[PDB]
């Protein structure tokens, strides 16, 4: 668990991420569906609230929704069940 702090696209580290899922494919689909929910919530905030809710962690200034979703998964804030 000792390294330099990762920077750019590699934060959070994938080898530490992967203990939350079973396999890389499931992790990819996990993050992509969460990012679709995030972007739908961001686009649909002008009117009344839809069934999707929020970046559960606080984002940066201009942060990509996929990166927000990955930090959520690393934050141990979601749960899922495969097909």
């Amino acid at each position: 668990g000792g390294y330099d702090t990762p920077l750019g696209i590699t934060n959070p580290p994938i080898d530490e991420l992967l203990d939350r899922v079973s396999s890389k494919y499931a992790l990819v689909i996990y993050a992509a569906k969460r990012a679709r929910q995030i972007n739908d919530y961001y686009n649909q905030l002008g009117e009344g609230i839809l069934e999707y809710v929020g970046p559960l962690v606080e984002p940066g200034l201009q942060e990509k929704p996929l990166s927000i979703a990955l930090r959520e998964i690393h934050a141990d804030l979601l749960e899922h069940t495969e097909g």
Binding site: I29, K33, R34, V53, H80, T81, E82, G83
Partner: protein
């Protein structure tokens, strides 16, 4: 048969599968590329495509 038509004798490969009414299965990787659906390997299998994503309820109340 759809994959088999890509090699040779496409007239011949069709014209006997036409007699047998040989329905294809769409299970390989060569045929799903042709008809433009998801390949059944990697992130295309039904274990990894029906994944439901939802927040945990201990963090639902923090929102």
């Amino acid at each position: 048969w759809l994959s088999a038509a890509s090699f040779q004798e496409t007239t011949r490969v069709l014209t006997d599968a036409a007699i047998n009414c040989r329905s294809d299965k769409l299970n390989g990787l060569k045929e799903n590329v042709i008809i433009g659906k998801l390949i059944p390997a990697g992130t295309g299998i039904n274990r990894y495509r029906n994944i439901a994503v939802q927040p945990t309820e201990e963090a639902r109340a923090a929102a």
